[PDB]
């Protein structure tokens, strides 16, 4: 279980920020798949900084 | 309206020349309009070959120049045969049903181009070497 503000590492192998550190901005309090919103320092090639991940793709390195 | 209307678009001075050439003329059969097309193009095509040739100051130059021009007409008979073999497959009908739209007469057109093309190449060989 990840909470907001927690510094996570992404295990989604397709992501631009795979195996990189980001801070969770929020989690969605419903049963929606991919609820974990992580904000990253580094922008991807579409110059965005957020994505929706699941709890299986993140860890709790804090 | 989809087509542009310039003042010289749809002018009767050039719409009358188009309607009377042997590609759009109404009275002709495909054997005749292949002959009229073939007689005109074979007549001038021997022009550049006898005056601009690899051999021009020879015995010698009027025949071999006109031998080259009938060489084009026998090449272009194949092109008119191959265009008819390809574009009219099964004699593919369309909305207009002319010689150009559906096939419907096409084997006669190529022979008409063959007869008039080889004619006027040889006909202009008479007016240059002789006459």
């Amino acid at each position: 279980m990840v909470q907001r503000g927690s510094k996570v590492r992404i295990l989604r192998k397709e992501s631009y920020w795979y195996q990189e550190i980001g801070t969770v901005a929020s989690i969605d309090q419903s049963g929606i798949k991919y609820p974990v919103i992580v904000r990253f320092e580094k922008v991807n090639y579409s110059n965005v900084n957020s994505n929706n991940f699941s709890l299986d793709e993140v860890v709790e390195v804090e | 309206i989809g087509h542009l209307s310039t003042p010289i678009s749809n002018s009767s001075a050039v719409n009358g020349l188009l309607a009377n050439l042997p590609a759009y003329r109404k009275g002709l059969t495909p054997r005749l309009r292949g002959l009229e097309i073939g007689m005109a193009h074979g007549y001038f095509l021997t022009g550049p070959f006898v005056e601009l040739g690899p051999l021009r100051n020879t015995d010698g130059g009027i025949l071999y120049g006109s031998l080259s021009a009938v060489g084009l007409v026998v090449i272009l008979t194949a092109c008119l045969a191959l265009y008819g073999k390809a574009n009219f497959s099964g004699s593919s009908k369309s909305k207009d049903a002319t010689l150009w739209e559906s096939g419907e007469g096409w084997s006669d057109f190529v022979s008409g181009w063959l007869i008039g093309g080889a004619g006027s190449v040889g006909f202009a060989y008479l007016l240059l070497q002789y006459i």
């Binding site: - | 188009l18 050439l21 590609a23 265009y83 390809a86 574009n87 150009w100």
Partner: protein, 72 residues
Amino acid sequence: MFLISWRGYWQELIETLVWAHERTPLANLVRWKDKPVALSIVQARLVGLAHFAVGYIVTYAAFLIASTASKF
């Protein structure tokens, strides 16, 4: 030409040559069966590289032969 210039210049150049062929009398009658398009993106990378590679090799083989056969 196939390396520097790329495709959608030529696709918009053929869309006017298609027009000028469909509106020219005595040639409006002759019709293609294949709609003319530009060479594809992967296609003219190969076409540009082929002309590059043949021209690379043909030029040296003419120079390497004639610069040595003239003197030995």
